[PDB]
Design a protein around this ligand. Sequence first.
Ligand SMILES: [Zn+2]
Ligand SMILES: [Zn+2]
Lengths: 78, 10
Amino acid sequence: SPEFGYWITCCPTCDVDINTWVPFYSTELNKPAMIYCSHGDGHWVHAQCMDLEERTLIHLSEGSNKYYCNEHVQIARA
Amino acid sequence: ARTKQTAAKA
Ligand SMILES: [Zn+2]
Ligand SMILES: [Zn+2]
């Protein structure tokens, strides 16, 4: 179910579907890795849908920076 | 940044 937050359509180009997904990152088991976007009220995106390389995803995860996804990072922030 | 499924676990 999408209610657990993984098997969702995360963005207009999202390719992830529970019937066809396969592991891609070294840290994945049976669920896609995701990252939190701070735009608006916030939302989660699949890392692979953002075209994040593993090293980049891990660097983001180990740091304290907020993240803005590819759809929202270019929107001016008041 | 907050992430999910980014660490090895046991
Ligand atoms: Zn996606
Ligand atoms: Zn976003």
